[PDB]
Design a binder for this molecule. Structure first.
Ligand code: HEM
Length: 280
């Protein structure tokens, strides 16, 4: 069994938009890296039913790029508002110990908010990937707007997973006015604007307890005028798509890079790509 494995994650609050043609950039494969595990999370509208019939292009296009690099799709899960797919290189899998398992958590009677957790074991180490989705208006188990539920947190099991990732738009925003936020963006004072970000507030309320976000050096990923790099200042610029990590068992998880993908500009939010090296 290997000393270390690499994991790439991407999430995007893509809304109504279809999957795009250059997936190598999206998955962080454009400089020839070969991650052991890839997870892709989307938030948007109407996936499961699929009235635009983009399901088949999703499958066609992802399966065509990834199967020829040695990936097996462990699971794709879709709801009306979320999608989560996890891929792993074929060479790591053993059917007798993989114990591939997904749950879906619903918090409302329309099944629009909640999350997905997909877990599996390779080399006797358990990985869990979560995505989640919450509305501002929702009544919730936390009495906050944040996309946390303890059922989605596999570090709060009696037998916590070894490597945990939570990816998606957490419904965490920047709590200041648009003018001040845009001034801090224009000055590139990322840490100054992050001071107003709600993740620390969620953690003060004991949500996302013990979860770490890699250092953010990129500008807010929302809200943009589509096809441009111009902020739509009808919303305070915020960091929407996030990647969080933790270990339940004291394993080292080292972020290598964490960045927004500004070249993908076709919508209001920009995708966020994180790359990690984990030590077994
Ligand atoms: C641009 C954002 C999107 C991304 C990144 C994305 C990503 C993915 C991924 C990675 C898969 C699994 C592919 C595989 O089989 O290996 C998938 C499946 C699927 N996607 Fe998307 N998707 C997007 C947009 C959409 C939209 C707008 C719809 C329509 C509502 C949609 C509908 C579906 C459906 C129905 C499946 C499952 C189809 C099947 O299992 O036959 N996707 N998507």
């Amino acid at each position: 069994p290997p000393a270390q494995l690499s994991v790439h994650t991407v999430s995007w609050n893509s809304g109504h938009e279809r999957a795009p043609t250059n997936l190598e950039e999206l998955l962080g494969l454009n400089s020839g890296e070969t991650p052991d595990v890839i997870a892709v999370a989307v938030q948007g509208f109407g996936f499961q039913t699929d009235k635009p019939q983009q399901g088949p292009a999703c499958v066609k296009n992802f399966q065509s790029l990834l199967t020829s690099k040695g990936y097996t799709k462990l699971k794709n899960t879709i709801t009306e508002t979320m999608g989560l797919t996890v891929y792993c290189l074929e060479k790591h899998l053993d059917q007798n110990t993989l114990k591939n398992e997904t749950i879906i958590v619903t918090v409302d009677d329309q099944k629009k908010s909640g999350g997905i957790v997909t877990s599996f074991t390779i080399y006797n180490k358990r990985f869990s990937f979560t995505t989640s989705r919450m509305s501002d208006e929702d009544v919730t188990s936390t009495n906050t707007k944040y996309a946390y539920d303890t059922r989605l947190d596999y570090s709060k099991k009696d037998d916590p997973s070894d490597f945990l990732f939570w990816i998606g738009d957490l419904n965490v925003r920047v709590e200041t006015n648009a003018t001040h936020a845009k001034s801090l963006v224009d000055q590139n004072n990322i840490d100054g604007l992050m001071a107003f970000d709600q993740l620390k507030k969620a953690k003060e309320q004991k949500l996302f307890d013990g979860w770490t976000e890699p250092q953010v050096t990129f500008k807010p990923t929302y809200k943009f005028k589509p096809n441009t790099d111009e902020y739509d200042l009808s919303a305070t610029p915020s960091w929407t798509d996030r990647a969080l990590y933790k270990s339940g068992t004291g394993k080292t998880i080292q972020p290598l890079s964490y960045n927004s993908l500004t070249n993908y500009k076709q919508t209001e939010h920009r995708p966020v790509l994180a790359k990690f090296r984990v030590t077994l």
